Amino acid sequence: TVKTGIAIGLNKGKKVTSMTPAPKISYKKGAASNRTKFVRSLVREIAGLSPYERRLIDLIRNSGEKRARKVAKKRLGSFTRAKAKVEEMNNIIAASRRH
Amino acid sequence: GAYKYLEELQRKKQSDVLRFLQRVRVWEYRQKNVIHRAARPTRPDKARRLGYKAKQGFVIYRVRVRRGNRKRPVPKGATYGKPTNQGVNELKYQRSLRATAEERVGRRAANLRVLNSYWVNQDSTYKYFEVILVDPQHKAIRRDARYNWICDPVHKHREARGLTATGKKSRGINKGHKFNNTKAGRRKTWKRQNTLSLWRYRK
Amino acid sequence: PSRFTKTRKHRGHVSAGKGRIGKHRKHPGGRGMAGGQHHHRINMDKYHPGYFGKVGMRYFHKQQAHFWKPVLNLDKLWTLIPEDKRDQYLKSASKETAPVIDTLAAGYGKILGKGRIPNVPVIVKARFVSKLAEEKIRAAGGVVELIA
Amino acid sequence: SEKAGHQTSAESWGTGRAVARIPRVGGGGTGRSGQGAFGNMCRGGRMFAPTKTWRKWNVKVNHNEKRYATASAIAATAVASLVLARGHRVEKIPEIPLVVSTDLESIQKTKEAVAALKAVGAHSDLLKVLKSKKLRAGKGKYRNRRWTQRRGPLVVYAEDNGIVKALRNVPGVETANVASLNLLQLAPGAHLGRFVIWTEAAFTKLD
Amino acid sequence: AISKNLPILKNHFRKHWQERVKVHFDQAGKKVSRRNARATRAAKIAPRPLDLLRPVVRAPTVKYNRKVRAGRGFTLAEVKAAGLTAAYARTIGIAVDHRRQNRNQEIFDANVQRLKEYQSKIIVFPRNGKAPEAEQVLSAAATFPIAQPATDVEARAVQDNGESAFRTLRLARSEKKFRGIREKRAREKAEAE
RNA sequence: UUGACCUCAAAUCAGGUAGGAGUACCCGCUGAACUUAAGCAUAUCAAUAAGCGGAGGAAAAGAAACCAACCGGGAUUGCCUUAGUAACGGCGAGUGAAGCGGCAAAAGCUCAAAUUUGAAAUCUGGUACCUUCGGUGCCCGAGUUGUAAUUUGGAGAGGGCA
RNA sequence: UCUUUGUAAAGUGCCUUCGAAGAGUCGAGUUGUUUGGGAAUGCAGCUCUAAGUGGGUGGUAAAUUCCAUCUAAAGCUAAAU
RNA sequence: CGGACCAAGGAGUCUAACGUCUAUGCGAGUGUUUGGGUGUAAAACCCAUACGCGUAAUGAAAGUGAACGUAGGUUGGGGCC
């Protein structure tokens, strides 16, 4: 987004011509690679399932997703991680019930 | 590449396969000594990524440290002083149990340099750490200049000064605004900020 | 120096300028700002009113770079153009050849309007400006554009 | 030393012992036992207000003040009254300021350097030094300040060619660059009118 | 303790500050030692200019963005645009920085013409053969002074349009302040038909 | 029965190494109280003294999970400033940074995560010799639960094309 | 001098496949200490315990939505001090 | 109450931040001495960039921000005409 040339506002600052340079390889540390997705899929197959994650799966299928998100926030750190884990629990429930 | 599989497998600590391995190995390390020698690591993935190469001159010990707080060693629970210091229980040791683990191992093997350490197991009473050590006078470490930095005479007893990763964590040595008291050491900053630097022509 | 102090003039006199009755002690009224609400209340009410209390809201992590706004008044606006070109620019007030003033280059953020620039067209580059400063610049024939 | 008067473990005996309340050295049987310490009035105790390193030693002067006093000191060298009143032998100097040729600066030997100064009239002021070589009054003579003598002429040059070496061993003379003009040389003892021989190039660069 | 009409002096000396007074008597001694360290460094690495070449970067924050200064090192894009390897640039006395990125054309242009001037002004001694008789310029910073960028002509014409640039300041502050509530109003007016 | 492997021993085995001193400075741990608050309990003293452990000519830190909100800077350290400021505090006594700016000094990098798999290519030790702060030859071991080369995120690897 | 030293190393331009990056660790709760750090700055104990276009930070807690900036939980390193 | 007597030592000092007053230099600016160059060498000399304080206040803050006039009128006002 271009600036405004004035000292205050949404886009306060001098007009400059950028380059949009070559992106760094970092900013991609959490990028999922093909072998790493393969390893995590195999590890999920052989680890079985966690005791709180067993509780989370029966909380999804019986007591509600809002209740399970409440429990997963009590288990993990915050709702940014509770929502990720409940979505992961929803995916592996749907994977267990498909085919 | 098996260590890629080993790392994600060992992250699943509440998995049934590794909880059973936790249950068996917590008994085995209980029955052994407090400080003993491990001939090969039980987490070779963690050893490789912490610096352990499986060549002679690299030593692995295993150590248990009693968990919990640090009771103040005052007689009969009485701390003679102001009421803010009267607490005896609920007092927490500033170094981690990893740092205590490396300290006791480094005293046992005073001839070896503590490279790193890592958590392997725990119970109610003990926490178990496999501590990586090197022989600084072994010729495989004095040669092969990737690892000959640790036989330099400033790196001896680095675990007793806080130079290892547990010590670097416990001293708060990180870049950030969260670590303004402890950037180059909290006492170095305290000297720098409490000295009255007076010049020849006074400012 | 030591020889021009009154300690040398107090040699011989018993209390050294401090009194027989009063008997100059270590800290007779307290230490520092001691008793500013109890026994130095009259001092802290007469000479420093406003000492005790939380006025205002707390501003966490203040950097003075955000509050960087030094002010240049209009009577000091023409100091910016140097004296080798100042007389050539005051005389022959020309709209086509107007002196530009990079006010930010010296380091004044905001131009204020304390008044009476000469009737010349002057180009003013600003980060901020006041209403009366612009009206007097408009009255002189100049223009204000904004820079950042 | 900050431990001086405090390498002692003297404790006051209190009252009830018919001696003063000063801290006294404990133990016994040494002569030092029972002796007062830890006070300015006591033998072996610390001084009152022990001298600290963080006392203001060097004094900041404004640069315009330093140049004002230097220009006043330079101007006082051109005054025939202030040079004579300061204690210099300029009764036979034909013109103040005494300006000599630039070839003085190229002098390599002290033997021709003294003959140059005697030729331009600084012979009496050079003889005023090395006849006044007196032993210093006081304790400072065994603090590497053993001999006092008067300060003779000053020789101001522009470009060095060997005159600073040639006048190093002559007593009382000092050689100063025309860039510097040290006020400690131009006004010794805060007294105006140092006898100064200028060279022609130093006089030209003084413009 | 509190006497007379005096300002409240917050003097922080209630600790044991006398144990930690550092008085710099060695200010003249360190300056001589620093010049001796510079002299023995130049004797060690003759005839290189004792410091690397630093870029012309723009200072951060709104207080100091009017002035350029010396950077830590040139970027990877700046050194590549000059036409030399970054490892090769380290060996020939150009400081290169791997975390500073290029997002300003005139700072990029000033830095690459600084690199073009540096490569034109230095020579690289051959690895084999007789090195040429070349004198040492002791200060690369004094060789390449940093000039402020060109802003405008000293005099120009007046563009009087009456657009009321104080009202431009007042309106831009207002539409910055009221953007979110107006967007929230424009949201609820859209989903309520 | 005989050979291993794994683990744990032993030996006045072969070769090594650690302790202790000093401790001014440094790295941590532990840790007060006098004091001040005109009392005193939070606070202050002070994240100090004492104690304990550990180094070196420096140590530590150190090439961002940084600062910032700028037209963005760019490892760490130190100094001048920030600043006695934002903030903390029976908001009392008092405590109290950091970014920027200028300067000094400036130096950057290395592993783990990839199969060399058309050849463990790596290393310690012994023995013999020589041109000995070591090298070569041979042998026994270590090592495939991974030692070398190649890569360290700024990138880098594979596959052609010149 | 080179039978030691070119069935050698290093870099540079395309295009394509990609791009592996550190776990009782981050983080959350609580406790104690510490900080200028104030719905909690750091550290530690206990309990829970991550993810991979992820995670941390952006000095008011929380939810939602972006943006910016880095790449932790592995390691070395002279000088200015 | 202290003092038998005598000799020596012996008690408002230094620093940081300032307040009033005075002196000096410069004066809408001022301050070189963090540092650099130079030096006869801890002296002296010279120097750039910032920064400090001042030239603008006010509000808790967002913010705003000082000529109707011969910079106003009245009264007194030294001195000058």
Swiss-Prot record, chain A:
Keyword Zinc tagged: no
Entry similarity comment: Belongs to the eukaryotic ribosomal protein eL36 family.
Alphabetized Pfam families for the sequence: Ribosomal_L36e
Name of protein: Large ribosomal subunit protein eL36A
Keywords: Acetylation, Cytoplasm, Ribonucleoprotein, Ribosomal protein
Subcellular location per the Swiss-Prot or TrEMBL entry: Cytoplasm
One BP annotation, GO: cytoplasmic translation
Residue numbers bearing the N-acetylthreonine modification: T1
Superkingdom classification of source: Eukaryota
PROSITE patterns linked: RIBOSOMAL_L36E
Processing and modification events after translation: N-terminally acetylated by acetyltransferase NatA.
Primary subcellular site in the record, as a coarse category: cytoplasm
GO molecular function: RNA binding; structural constituent of ribosome
Signal peptide annotation: none
Cellular component annotations (GO), alphabetically ordered: cytosol; cytosolic large ribosomal subunit
Complex and partners: Component of the large ribosomal subunit (LSU). Mature yeast ribosomes consist of a small (40S) and a large (60S) subunit. The 40S small subunit contains 1 molecule of ribosomal RNA (18S rRNA) and 33 different proteins (encoded by 57 genes). The large 60S subunit contains 3 rRNA molecules (25S, 5.8S and 5S rRNA) and 46 different proteins (encoded by 81 genes).
Keyword Ribosomal protein: yes
Other remarks in the entry: Present with 31600 molecules/cell in log phase SD medium. There are 2 genes for eL36 in yeast.
Swiss-Prot record, chain B:
InterPro entries: Rbsml_eL15_core_dom_sf, Ribosomal_eL15, Ribosomal_eL15_CS, Ribosomal_uL23/eL15/eS24_sf
Protein's job: Component of the ribosome, a large ribonucleoprotein complex responsible for the synthesis of proteins in the cell. The small ribosomal subunit (SSU) binds messenger RNAs (mRNAs) and translates the encoded message by selecting cognate aminoacyl-transfer RNA (tRNA) molecules. The large subunit (LSU) contains the ribosomal catalytic site termed the peptidyl transferase center (PTC), which catalyzes the formation of peptide bonds, thereby polymerizing the amino acids delivered by tRNAs into a polypeptide chain.
Residue stretches spanning the membrane: none
A Pfam entry, by short name: Ribosomal_L15e
Alphabetical keyword list: Cytoplasm, Ribonucleoprotein, Ribosomal protein
Gene Ontology MF term list: RNA binding; structural constituent of ribosome
Name listed for the protein in its UniProt record: Large ribosomal subunit protein eL15A
Organism of derivation: Saccharomyces cerevisiae (strain ATCC 204508 / S288c)
NCBIfam families reported for this sequence: PRK04243.1
Compartments where located: Cytoplasm
Compositional bias per record (Basic residues), positions renumbered to this chain: 168-184
Region of interest: Disordered: 163-184
Any GO BP annotation: cytoplasmic translation
Curated annotation (Swiss-Prot), chain C:
Pfam families, alphabetized: Ribosomal_L27A
Motif (Nuclear localization signal): 6-12, 23-29
UniProt KW keywords: Cytoplasm, Isopeptide bond, Ribonucleoprotein, Ribosomal protein, Ubl conjugation
UniProt GO molecular function: RNA binding; structural constituent of ribosome
Spans annotated as Disordered: 1-38
SUPFAM superfamilies according to UniProt: Ribosomal proteins L15p and L18e
Locations listed in the record: Cytoplasm
Keyword Transmembrane helix: no
Gene3D superfamilies per UniProt: 3.100.10.10
Example of a GO biological process term: cytoplasmic translation
Keyword presence, Zinc-finger: no
One term under GO cellular component: cytosolic large ribosomal subunit
Basic residues compositional bias, start-end: 1-13, 20-29
Chief location category: cytoplasm
Cross-link Glycyl lysine isopeptide (Lys-Gly) (interchain with G-Cter in ubiquitin) mapped to chain: K95
Function of the protein: Component of the ribosome, a large ribonucleoprotein complex responsible for the synthesis of proteins in the cell. The small ribosomal subunit (SSU) binds messenger RNAs (mRNAs) and translates the encoded message by selecting cognate aminoacyl-transfer RNA (tRNA) molecules. The large subunit (LSU) contains the ribosomal catalytic site termed the peptidyl transferase center (PTC), which catalyzes the formation of peptide bonds, thereby polymerizing the amino acids delivered by tRNAs into a polypeptide chain.
Matches recorded under HAMAP family: Ribosomal_uL15
Subunit structure: Component of the large ribosomal subunit (LSU). Mature yeast ribosomes consist of a small (40S) and a large (60S) subunit. The 40S small subunit contains 1 molecule of ribosomal RNA (18S rRNA) and 33 different proteins (encoded by 57 genes). The large 60S subunit contains 3 rRNA molecules (25S, 5.8S and 5S rRNA) and 46 different proteins (encoded by 81 genes).
UniProt-recorded name of the protein: Large ribosomal subunit protein uL15
Swiss-Prot record, chain E:
GO CC list: cytosol; cytosolic large ribosomal subunit
PROSITE patterns: RIBOSOMAL_L13E
Role: Component of the ribosome, a large ribonucleoprotein complex responsible for the synthesis of proteins in the cell. The small ribosomal subunit (SSU) binds messenger RNAs (mRNAs) and translates the encoded message by selecting cognate aminoacyl-transfer RNA (tRNA) molecules. The large subunit (LSU) contains the ribosomal catalytic site termed the peptidyl transferase center (PTC), which catalyzes the formation of peptide bonds, thereby polymerizing the amino acids delivered by tRNAs into a polypeptide chain.
One of the Pfam families matching this protein, by short name: Ribosomal_L13e
Protein name (record): Large ribosomal subunit protein eL13A
GO molecular function: RNA binding; structural constituent of ribosome
Location(s) in or outside the cell: Cytoplasm
A single GO BP: cytoplasmic translation
Modified residues (Phosphothreonine): T143, T151
Subunit structure as annotated in this protein's UniProt entry: Component of the large ribosomal subunit (LSU). Mature yeast ribosomes consist of a small (40S) and a large (60S) subunit. The 40S small subunit contains 1 molecule of ribosomal RNA (18S rRNA) and 33 different proteins (encoded by 57 genes). The large 60S subunit contains 3 rRNA molecules (25S, 5.8S and 5S rRNA) and 46 different proteins (encoded by 81 genes).
Family designation: Belongs to the eukaryotic ribosomal protein eL13 family.
Further facts: Present with 133000 molecules/cell in log phase SD medium.
Organism: Saccharomyces cerevisiae (strain ATCC 204508 / S288c)
Transmembrane spans: none
